[PDB]
Amino acid sequence: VHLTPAEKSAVTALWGKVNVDEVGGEALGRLLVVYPWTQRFFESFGDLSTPDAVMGNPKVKAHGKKVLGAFSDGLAHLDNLKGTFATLSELHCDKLHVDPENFRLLGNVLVCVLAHHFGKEFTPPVQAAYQKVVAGVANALAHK
Template sequence: MVHWTAEEKAAITSVWQKVNVEHDGHDALGRLLIVYPWTQRYFSNFGNLSNSAAVAGNAKVQAHGKKVLSAVGNAISHIDSVKSSLQQLSKIHATELFVDPENFKRFGGVLVIVLGAKLGTAFTPKVQAAWEKFIAVLVDGLSQGYN
């Protein structure tokens, strides 16, 4: 079990209140698909992802980005039991979608970049540290179905 300080919880939830799951989810998933183009193989039914403009304008990327960030929000709402809250989602990614769990780390890194860009100087090193810790817990929770 992870120990969260009150300061860490406050940093995570205060940032999350500023997140627009539709816009920021699209940005984060789009960045993942552009920066790590091999991740596109999991989204073969999304149509044209051949370049940055195609990814940015893709409605399926936008919808799935929103879905992913909604799941992140759910994990935040269960911050004291992230791993158990992600059990079913992890199982689906492991046994049905066959997603390489390294991609959870990649997405987490991209999400931190998106949040930092969005918040600017408000995304202090302490806030980033809390988010990096949360992302590590999130990745661990999403990876549990692979064991």
């Protein structure tokens, strides 16, 4: 929601280094592995029976890139997160009935993946800014 200008710069600087072909799919894959009931919403994706099956699943990697693209849109619309995700909120809440705690889980898994990729560069202040971002995205997706 409200990031200080220095917080906004730090978040934007790190995001520009994100590998858009792996981080998204790894976050989704880890969600399906660490919180296995989430697999129920992805019955059309095929083999999710082992962690390697999940992380290697082409539909997981493909869909993970789409999720990561939505986070990028939220990052450029921190003032109006409710409007950017209003469509996506209707999809997840009225069509899919995803319990919103799962939104919080995915945001925290993404934060783990960012820590995994950047190591010591993912400092506690940078994490603190990202927790505000993912909380705001999760709140927007549950708005409806």
